[PDB]
Amino acid sequence: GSHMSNISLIVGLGNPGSEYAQTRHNAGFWFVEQLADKYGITLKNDPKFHGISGRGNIEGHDVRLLLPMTYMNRSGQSVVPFSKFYQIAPEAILIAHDELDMNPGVIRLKTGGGHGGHNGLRDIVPHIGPNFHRLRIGIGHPGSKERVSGHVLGKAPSNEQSLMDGAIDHALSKVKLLVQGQVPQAMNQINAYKPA
Numbered sequence: 001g002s003h004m005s006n007i008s009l010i011v012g013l014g015n016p017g018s019e020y021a022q023t024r025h026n027a028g029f030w031f032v033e034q035l036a037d038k039y040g041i042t043l044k045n046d047p048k049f050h051g052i053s054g055r056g057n058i059e060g061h062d063v064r065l066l067l068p069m070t071y072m073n074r075s076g077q078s079v080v081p082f083s084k085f086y087q088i089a090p091e092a093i094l095i096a097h098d099e100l101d102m103n104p105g106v107i108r109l110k111t112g113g114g115h116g117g118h119n120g121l122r123d124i125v126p127h128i129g130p131n132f133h134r135l136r137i138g139i140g141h142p143g144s145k146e147r148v149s150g151h152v153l154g155k156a157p158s159n160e161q162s163l164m165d166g167a168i169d170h171a172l173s174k175v176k177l178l179v180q181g182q183v184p185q186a187m188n189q190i191n192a193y194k195p196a
């Protein structure tokens with residue numbers, strides 16, 4: 001299975017389909033797809049676990065990537081059985097997701113805590129507990145709670161998209177630390193990112 005807090009499973013949350021691919025709620029997909037491309041990890045169809053998944057080497061470590069294809073609020077129906085089958089403990093899991101409570105261009109590595117109202121995380125924490133790592137990709141908040149669906153299911157304006165893209169790019173460069181178990185250093189160096 002997994003080994004200590006070397007990250008060996010990286011999950012990106014999002015919704016399937018071209019209609020959702022550019023929406024803010026797919027920030028985790030963006031990160032994992034870009035990471036897969038950087039390291040040459042093939043993301044292939046994985047019907048058994050209701051997702052797309054891959055396995056390959058990141059910096060000398062065997063890592064698995066997962067994009068649930070369940071729709072966001074059923075993400076645990078992919079992540080939980082996958083992690084159980086491969087014997088990956090929460091402490092070895094990184095979940096990338098959009099974060100309403102942070103600005104575009106802000107990114108943070110967090111360990112633990114609740115779902116913060118994120119309905120993908122809400123589907124995962126009850127099963128595996130909170131002690132997985134999160135890459136919180138700021139997307140901003142619409143202001144009101146009745147607007148949250150329109151915000152997360154919206155396509156950001158170009159300035160906000162550029163700010164998210166730069167943050168995601170920065171985080172990609174820090175995955176080496178994570179797969180090596182250097183979570184403190186990764187946290188410091190990811191959380192210090194500024195866009196300008």
Ligand SMILES: Nc1ccn([C@@H]2O[C@H](CO)[C@@H](O)[C@@H]2O)c(=O)n1
Pocket residue numbers: 021022023030161165
């Ligand atoms: N055909 C496409 C076009 C874009 N994207 C993703 O949407 C973000 C915003 O355009 C991009 O940053 C990101 O690539 C996608 O996944 N597939």
